[PDB]
């Protein structure tokens, strides 16, 4: 591969890592628009616009977990806002459901989720973290929200 490192199981990119290789130009620079990095079954991060993936170690930078995501583990190794992956992005986290305090089961029923207005809860959880809620899909518990940077 021409610079990019991604080996953690379950992770992928759109375009695929193989496609990113061929996109690399004569001077070895990988610039792509609308790039996505995801982990099958847990979520993904969509970066609208052009980004320079040249010599980025995505294994060390991007971390997608259940109901959680991290980009750049420490602030010291983080580039300024607008450069690298520290920029505007749309995050999707899957398997996001509340737990019934009586049965201790996950609440996946759309009607039940509308009863407790889980969507409004996720709007609040987004603002409190500096993000803007976008939508929620009960069938898969997909919580989509935009972030100004990481």
């Amino acid at each position: 591969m021409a610079g990019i490192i991604l080996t953690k199981v379950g992770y992928y990119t759109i375009p695929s890592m193989d496609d990113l290789a061929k996109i690399t130009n004569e001077k070895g620079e990988c610039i792509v628009s609308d790039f996505t990095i995801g982990r099958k079954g847990y979520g993904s991060i969509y970066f609208e616009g052009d980004v320079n993936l040249t010599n980025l170690n995505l294994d060390d930078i991007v971390h997608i977990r259940r109901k959680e995501v991290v980009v750049y583990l420490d602030d010291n190794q983080k580039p300024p806002v607008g450069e690298g992956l520290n920029r505007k992005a749309e995050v999707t986290l899957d398997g996001v459901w509340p737990t019934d305090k009586t049965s201790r089961c996950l609440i996946k029923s759309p009607d039940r989720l509308a009863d407790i207005n889980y969507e409004g809860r996720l709007e609040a959880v987004s603002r409190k973290q500096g993000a803007q809620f976008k939508e929620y899909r009960p069938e898969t518990g997909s919580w989509v929200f935009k972030v100004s940077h990481f």
Binding site: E68, V69, V96, T102, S103, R104, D115, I116
Partner: protein, 409 residues
């Protein structure tokens, strides 16, 4: 009678003039016939004698003052130490000795120096963003004083004053990330009353009964946990955490989110009060199971008894069936007149739940808005709340945002 002249004492002018120059605030505590008022600007206590003049008071100085703001003060069970509780630290002050016919500190000197010791100082400087969410004393009146600290890392640590930098016990309950489980973190805890428990509960043997205290832990999302603490027999790293306690009956709104305060009333079976930022108060009976469950006997909406503010809960020194709630709108008193109907044998089986349900349909608690702090422009929370226990009638002291001393009744 001090109920008459205390609001005119100069200490409130002093504190009021200190204004012109998050945790819920409580800058006052009482001991004997004395009232202690934390003066943030001078990092000292102003002590007013209520029993036995408007200008007279003692100043108890910190030999080594705290540099972080003190939000709450908390007298120890043995009453020889005061916890100075802030967001960015905790400091313990040792009270000086009394002597003289009036039992004044150090014979009535105008100013008395008090020894202080910081607690868990490493955790608040090493991790800059680590904050204190809740603190209390281990309830024992016999053992060395121990403070219990819940920090923003979702960990509870217990410290002896003999080793204030090294926890005697740690309870891992399990910000760089974006997360949907933002409420899976502890915001408060409260100890229940003394209980005798089998020594086998802590892994040791002999079929012998030991002293322990139930520790109830409240998550922001409203979930509750329970563990029994014995400073002698508990392991250094406590892992026998029970919960989340199932909450019965099933509620359409799942009892919401945004829980902010918990109180264990001193009764058997234990009864928990869970308060939310929206003004919801849940009265929960702890039913024995090995995981116990909660039966929400009733719910009270303070928004109706008059709302997005932090709510603080206070026990009543006289009656286990009464507690008080402080918020930006003032003080509410809540009387659970049905507490005395619940017997000590109650369990968590179906027939017990049905009996509790049937009983809740013919019993209701008494809620009263006893003090109103609502402004004419932006509401402000109170700074102090204390119930002076007198058998001839409890007197309540409430210090407003401007250090006005309201007394009830």
């Amino acid at each position: 009678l001090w109920q008459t002249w205390l609001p005119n004492h100069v200490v409130f002018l002093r504190l009021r003039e200190g204004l012109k120059n998050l945790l819920t605030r409580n800058v006052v505590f009482g001991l004997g016939g004395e009232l202690f008022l934390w003066d943030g600007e001078d990092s000292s206590f102003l002590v007013v004698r209520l029993r036995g003049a408007l200008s007279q008071y003692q100043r108890l100085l910190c030999i080594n003052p705290p540099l972080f703001e003190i939000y709450q003060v908390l007298l120890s069970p043995t009453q020889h130490h005061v916890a100075l509780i802030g967001i960015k630290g905790l400091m313990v002050l040792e009270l000086p000795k009394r002597w003289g016919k009036n039992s004044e500190f150090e014979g009535g000197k105008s100013t008395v120096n008090c020894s202080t010791t910081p607690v868990a100082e490493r955790f608040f400087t090493s991790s800059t963003s680590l904050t204190l969410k809740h603190a209390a004393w281990y309830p024992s009146e016999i053992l060395d004083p121990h403070v219990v600290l819940l920090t923003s890392d979702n960990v509870i640590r217990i410290y002896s004053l003999r080793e204030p930098q090294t926890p005697t016990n740690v309870i891992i309950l399990s910000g760089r990330a974006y997360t949907a489980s933002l409420g899976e973190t502890a915001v408060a805890f409260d100890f229940g009353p003394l209980a005798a428990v089998p020594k086998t509960l802590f892994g040791q043997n002999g079929k012998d009964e030991v002293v322990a205290y139930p520790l109830y832990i409240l998550y922001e999302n409203g979930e509750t946990f329970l563990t029994y603490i014995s400073l002698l027999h508990s392991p250094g790293n406590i892992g026998k955490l029970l919960g989340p306690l199932p909450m019965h009956p099933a509620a359409e709104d799942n009892y919401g989110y945004d829980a902010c305060a918990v109180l264990c009333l001193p009764c058997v079976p234990n009864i928990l009060v869970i308060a939310t930022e929206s003004g919801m108060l849940y009265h929960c009976v702890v039913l024995e199971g090995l995981i116990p469950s909660l039966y929400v006997f009733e719910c009270v909406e303070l928004e109706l008894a008059l709302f997005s503010c932090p709510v603080k809960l206070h026990r009543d020194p006289k009656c286990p069936s009464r507690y008080h709630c402080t918020h930006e709108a003032g003080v509410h008193s809540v009387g659970l007149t049905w507490i005395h109907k619940l017997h000590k044998f109650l369990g968590s089986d179906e027939e017990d739940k049905d009996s509790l349900q049937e009983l809740s349909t013919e019993q209701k608690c008494f809620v009263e808005h006893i003090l109103c702090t609502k402004p004419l422009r932006q509401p402000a929370p109170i700074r102090g709340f204390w119930i002076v226990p007198d058998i001839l009638g409890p007197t309540m002291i409430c210090i407003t945002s401007t250090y006005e001393c309201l007394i009830w009744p």
